[PDB]
């Protein structure tokens, strides 16, 4: 998490930097 969903983060534009997330 965080680091492989990056590739997802780019997409999420949140991803990773929350930490958190959940939704």
């Known amino acids: 998490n ?3 969903h ?3 983060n ?3 534009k ?3 930097v929350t ?3 959940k939704g």
């Open 19 to 21: 930490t958190t997330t």
């Open 6 to 8: 990056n590739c997802v």
């Open 14 to 16: 949140q991803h990773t």
């Open 2 to 4: 965080n680091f492989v």
């Open 10 to 12: 780019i997409t999420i």
